[PDB]
Amino acid sequence: SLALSLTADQMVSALLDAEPPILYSESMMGLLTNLADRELVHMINWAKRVPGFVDLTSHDQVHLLECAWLEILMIGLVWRSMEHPGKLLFAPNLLLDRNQGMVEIFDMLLATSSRFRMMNLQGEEFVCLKSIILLNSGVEEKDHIHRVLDKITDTLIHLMAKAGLTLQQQHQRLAQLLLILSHIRHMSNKGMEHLYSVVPSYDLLLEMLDA
């Protein structure tokens, strides 16, 4: 695979160019649903640019997206709201605070954003985490996925070492970031059930990917 031959800088470079744009919004449910739908179209294009992803069968690509799509939207939102304490930046024209807040998810999203802030999470680290979520949430195929995940781990470590972190600080920060993903999974699952009152089907995601 070409993904397995990528260096850390190349992995970072690839993920950075694959970044979807920050979309604008056009009731709260309507605006967010409209935003989420348009975001999903970009997520498909982004996923197909994640190194090692298209090497998977179309069936495996769908399953990964079906499991991780809300986590990816959420970590995006959290990343966007990082420099706006006490507020969620769904869109540049849709900045919501706690009072406008569902409130349980809101607080957890706020807590994740504040966590990214105190860790001063970098954009290079962020795109690494986002692709990790894609490949891990729904995980020869499983073997290949785990190899790519090792690459992203090596990529994360290289970024930290280049930033001047000691070997100890490197495994600690690596641990801190990956444990945040556990909280992201939790927010996603709670969001899913609160959503059932709307979700991308297997067939829908397969059709979008085939474009």
Ligand X SMILES: O=S(=O)(Oc1ccc(Br)cc1)[C@@H]1C[C@@H]2O[C@H]1C(c1ccc(OCCN3CCCCC3)cc1)=C2c1ccc(O)cc1
Please report, as ranges, the residues that interact with a copy of itself according to CB under 8 A. 107-108, 111-112, 115, 132, 136-137, 146, 149-150, 153-154, 156-157, 167-168, 170-172, 174-176, 178-179, 181-186, 189-190, 193
The phi, psi pair for 64, rounded to 5°, reads -65, -40
Nearest approach, Cβ of residue 139 and a copy of itself (Å): 8
| Alpha carbon 165 to its chain's center | 24
Please indicate if the annotation marks 193 as binding a ligand.
no
Residue type, 10: Q
Count Cα neighbours of 193 within 13 Å in the Cβ-side half-sphere: 7
The H or E element spanning position 174 is helix 167-195
Question: Residue 4 binds which one of a copy of itself, ligand X, none, with CB within 5 to 8 A depending on kind?
Answer: none
37 is a contact residue toward ligand X (CB under 6 A): yes
Helix or strand or coil: residue 80? helix
Q: How many angstroms separate the CA atoms of 177 and 132, rounded?
A: 11
Please indicate if the annotation marks 80 as binding a ligand.
yes
105 is a contact residue toward ligand X (CB under 6 A): yes
39 is a contact residue toward ligand X (CB under 6 A): yes
- The residues, any chain, with a CB within 8 Å of residue 9's CB and separated by 6 or more, are 158
Please indicate if the annotation marks 115 as binding a ligand.
no
First to last CA, the chain: 23
Question: Residue 185 binds which one of ligand X, a copy of itself, none, with CB within 5 to 8 A depending on kind?
Answer: a copy of itself
Of 35 and 185, nearer to a copy of itself (C-beta) is 185
Contact pattern from residue 128 through residue 167 relative to ligand X, giving x for each residue in contact according to CB under 6 A and a dash for the rest: ----------------------------------------
Cα diameter, the chain? 49
Q: Which of 97, 85, 111, 123 is nearest to 187 (CA)?
A: 111
Task: Return the range that interacts with ligand X (CB under 6 A); candidates 13-21, 44-52, 68-76, 168-176.
Answer: 68-76
Of 136 and 188, nearer to ligand X (C-beta) is 188
Q: How many angstroms separate the CA atoms of 193 and 201, rounded?
A: 15
Which residues of this protein are in contact with ligand X, per CB under 6 A? 32-33, 35-37, 39-40, 73-74, 76-77, 90, 102, 105, 191, 194-195, 198, 200, 204
Annotated binding site for 17beta-estradiol: 39, 80, 194
